[PDB]
From a paper:
N4-like phages have a genome size of about 75 kb, nearly twice that of T7, and encode around 70–90 ORFs, including a characteristic large virion-associated RNA polymerase (vRNAP) unique to this family of bacterial viruses. The massive 3,500-residue vRNAP 18,19, present in 4 ± 1 copies inside the mature virion 20, is ejected into the host upon infection. In stark contrast to the N4 transcriptional program, which has been studied extensively 17, many key questions about the role of phage N4 vRNAP as an ejection protein and its part in the DNA ejectosome remain unanswered. vRNAP (gp50) consists of three predicted domains: a likely membrane-spanning N-terminal domain (NTD), a single-subunit RNA polymerase (RNAP) domain, and a large C-terminal domain of unknown function (CTD). In this study, we use a complementary top-down and bottom-up approach by determining the cryo-EM structures of both the full-length recombinantly expressed vRNAP and the fully asymmetric N4 virion tail.
We purified N4 virions to homogeneity and determined the high-resolution structure of phage N4 tails from filled virions (FV) and empty particles (EP) to 3.2 Å and 3.6 Å, respectively. The tail has a total vertical length of 450 Å, formed by the HT-adapter (gp67), tail tube (gp54), and tail plug (gp53), and is attached to the head through interactions between the HT-adapter and the portal (gp59). Surrounding the tail is a six-fold symmetric non-contractile sheath formed from a heterodimer of the minor subunit gp64 and the major subunit gp65 22. Tails from EPs are remarkably similar in structure to FVs, and comparison of the similarly resolved maps identified three critical differences after the genome is ejected from the capsid. First, the portal undergoes two major changes: the collapse of the barrel helices beyond residue 667 20 and the narrowing of the portal tunnel from 33 Å to 25 Å due to restructuring of the tunnel loop. Second, the ejection protein gp51, which forms a α-helical hairpin adjacent to the wingtip domain of the portal, disappears in the empty virions. Third, we identified 12 fragments of approximately 16 residues inside the lumen of the HT-adaptor, which are absent in EP, comprising the N-terminus of the ejection protein gp52 16. Interestingly, the tail tube appeared sealed in both the full and empty particles. Surprisingly, both the N4 mature virion and empty particle have a density for the tail plug, suggesting that the plug is not lost in the environment after receptor binding but remains tethered to the tail complex, available for reattachment after ejection proteins and DNA have been released.
Numbering used by the authors:
A (entry chain SA): 3 to 105
B (entry chain LA): 122 to 361
C (entry chain LB): 122 to 181
D (entry chain LA): 422 to 722
E (entry chain TA), F (entry chain TB): 2 to 50
Write the structure that this text describes.
Amino acid sequence: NAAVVPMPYSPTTVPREQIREIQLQLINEMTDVHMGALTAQYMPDDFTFEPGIGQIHFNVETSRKVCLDLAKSVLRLVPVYPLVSPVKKQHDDYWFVGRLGLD
Amino acid sequence: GLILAFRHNPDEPDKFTVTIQTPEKAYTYRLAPYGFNNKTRRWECLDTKYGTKRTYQADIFVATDEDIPESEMTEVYGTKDYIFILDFADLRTGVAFNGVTINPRNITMISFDCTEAHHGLGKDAYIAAMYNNDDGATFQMEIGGIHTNAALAAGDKLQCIWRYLDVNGNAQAAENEFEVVSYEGFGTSNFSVKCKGMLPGKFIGCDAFYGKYLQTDGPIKQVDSVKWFTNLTVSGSGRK
Amino acid sequence: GLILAFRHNPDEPDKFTVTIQTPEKAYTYRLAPYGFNNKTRRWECLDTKYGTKRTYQADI
Amino acid sequence: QDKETGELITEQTVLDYPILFAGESQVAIHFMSGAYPDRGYDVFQKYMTETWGINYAGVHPINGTTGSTAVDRACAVNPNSEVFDPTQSSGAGGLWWWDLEADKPGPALLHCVGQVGKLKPKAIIWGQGDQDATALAYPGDRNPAPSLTRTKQATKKVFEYLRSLYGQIPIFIQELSYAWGITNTDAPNVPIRTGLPSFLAARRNTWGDIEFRWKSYGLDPALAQYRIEIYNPSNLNQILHSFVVSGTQEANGYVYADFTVEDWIPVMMEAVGSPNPWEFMKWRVVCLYQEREIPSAPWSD
Amino acid sequence: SCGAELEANALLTALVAGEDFTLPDIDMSGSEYDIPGGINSPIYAEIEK
Amino acid sequence: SCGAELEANALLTALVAGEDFTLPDIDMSGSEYDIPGGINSPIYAEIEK
C-alpha cells in the first residue's frame, strides 16, 4: 500500500539528509576516497531503545555489519599488505655474528 | 626505617623496576614515577590507575648536584620532572603493587634494572586479544607492535595487566604472568603466541605488558647512552 | 602427604579395589575411575552416584 | 646474516598499521557495549587481517571517539564553557572539534590526538553529523546560528589539521544515519511499534471544513481501524471530541478523515455558544490494530 | 505559608523560657579526637611470624 | 507537584535555624580503615600442624 511508510517521521530527518549532502559533496571535491559505508538502509528496529531518550544508537549486531562494510571499503583501496620487513626467512636461516663495525 | 629518593632517566619510566635479593629468593619491585604537586606541596604518584597511592613530603628529596639534562630524559604522563621514591616500609611486589610485601630486615643487595628501549619484544609491544583454546591445557595470545629483530622461545615469562568480563556480567581487572609454549609469525611484527593457563573470562582490553628477558638473543642497532642517578637523598629513622 | 596416580586395565573398573594392611586389620579401599574434564581442566570421578566427589588438578 | 648469503641485517623496525576512529558516539558503539569477539571493531580487525593473510595483530585500530560532540561551537551544547566533560556531567562544556570563530582546534579534537599518542595512523574513519543535525533543527538563541557553510568549512579544515600532524593518508567517512526521538513524553517507557500513526497533517478550506491526514507504519492501514482524539482548546490536557474512522479511508497516498462544518459546529456549541472558527487545534490519532491502542505524537500547530 | 513557622518559633521560646539549655560545643574534627600514627605508623606495618 | 518539595525545604530551614548540625566527613574507603596485608599476607597462609 502507498499509505504505509517504513520510517517514522522525525523533526531532524531533513537536516540529517541535508548534512548527508554536505558530506557527500565533500567526498567528490577531495583527493582520496572518503566513502566509508552506507547506513541509510537501517530502520528503527536496528536501534536499541533507551527509556526517556529513544532509539539513537545502533544494535551490537547492526554496528557489527557496519564495521564489516568499513573493512571491505578499505580493502578495495588497499588490496595487498603495503609493509615488508627487512628479514624474509625464518629465524633458523640467519646467523648471529658480531662485527667490529661497518668499517 | 630508610627511604631513598633520586632522579633517573630510564627508557620505560612506567616499567622501571628494582630487584631485591633476599636470602630466600629474588623479589622484584616496581618504582612508579612521582611528581611534585604544587598546590598540596607533596609528592604524589603520577600513575593514578595502578600507582602506590602514597604521598610524601617535599623534604624527602633535596637537589644539590647538577640536574639531569632535559633532552636526555624521557617524558611520561606529559611530564619530564619526576623522581623515583624507594621506601623500605612499603616494599609491595607485583606489577600493580598487589604482590607479597618484602621483609626489609634481611636484604643482601639492591639491583636496579637498567635496560634499553628495544629490549625484549620492544617498547611498542601490545596485546590484541586473548582467548582459550579448545584444548584443555593452553590458551592463545595475540601480540603486535614487535620490532623485527625480536625472537621468542618456549619457557619465557610475560607480565600483563588486563581487564576481563566476569561470568556475572560485571567488568573485572586482574594481573598475572604467562609462560610461552610456542608462537608463529617470526619477523612479521605480529606473533600468535600459545601459552599455558586459563582465562577467567572474556578478554576486553590490556593495560600493561612487559615481554622482557627473552631466552633468544637478537641484534639491535648499536647506540650509546648515558644513565644518570642524580641527587641520591636518604632519610628515615634507620641507621644512615 | 602422598598421592599416587597411574593407569590400569582391570576387568571390572568400577569394582577395582586396593587392600591396605594396617597393623590392626586388613582394610579394603575402592579406586573409582577418574576422567579428565576438558572444560574445567580438572580430574573428576566418573561415578556420579557413589563416587568420591573429589577434584584433582591436571598436574597430578 | 643469511646461511647461504653474506648480507648483513642490523636494523629493526615495526610493521604496525594503526587505523584512527573518531567522531560522534555512533562510531563509539563499535568499541563499547560488548567484549571480544562480539565487539564491532573485533570483526573489522578479524576480516581485514584474514584477507591480507597477516596475523590478528597486524591491524591496530584506535578509539578516539566522543559522545555528543559537534564540529563547531555553534552546534555545541555549551558553546561558552571550555572545560572538557565527555560524560555530560556537571558543566558539559567544550565538546566541539573546531572553533571557526577563532580558527582554533577544539578540546574534543585535542582529546582525539591524545588518544593516538605515539602511534602513527595510516587511515581515518569519521562520522559526526548527529549533533549538528539537531542543533540546526533548533537554532534557538545561539548568536552563531548553525549553517551548512559553517559545518562544511569546519569539517573541511579539521581533516586538514589531522593531515598536518600525520601523512597524506586516506580518510573514510561514515554517512550520517537516522535517529528517532521518543513519541510521548508522558510515557517514556514505550518504544516505536508497528501500526504507529505518523506524518500527522491538518488542512482546511475557505468554507471551514477540517481534514486530518496520517500514514501508518509497519502494516496496511486498510486492515486496522483508527480513532481521532481532539483536545479542548481551553483545557489542553482534556480530550474534547473523538470519533472512529475505519480502514480503507485512504487517498492520495494518505489516510484521511473528514471533519466538516456540520461536524465541528455542534461540538463547538458546548464550548462556546457561538460558532467561532477553529483556527488552532491540538489533536491525536490512535490506531486500533488487534484491539491495541497506539497513540501518536500530538499535532499542536 | 500564612506564617506557620513564625508562630511555632514564638510559642517555643515562650513556653520553655526561664531555663538554660546550652548544648556543649565540641569539635570532633580535631586531631585530639583522632588516633595519631596514620598510614605510616608501625600499627599498619605487616606482622612477621 | 504544585511545589510541594519547595515548601518542605523552606520550612525545614527556618524551623531548625540557629544551631549547628554539621555531620562529620570521614572517608571509609581509604587504606586506614582497611586491614593491611592482603591475600598475600601470612595471615592467609595455611597453618601447618
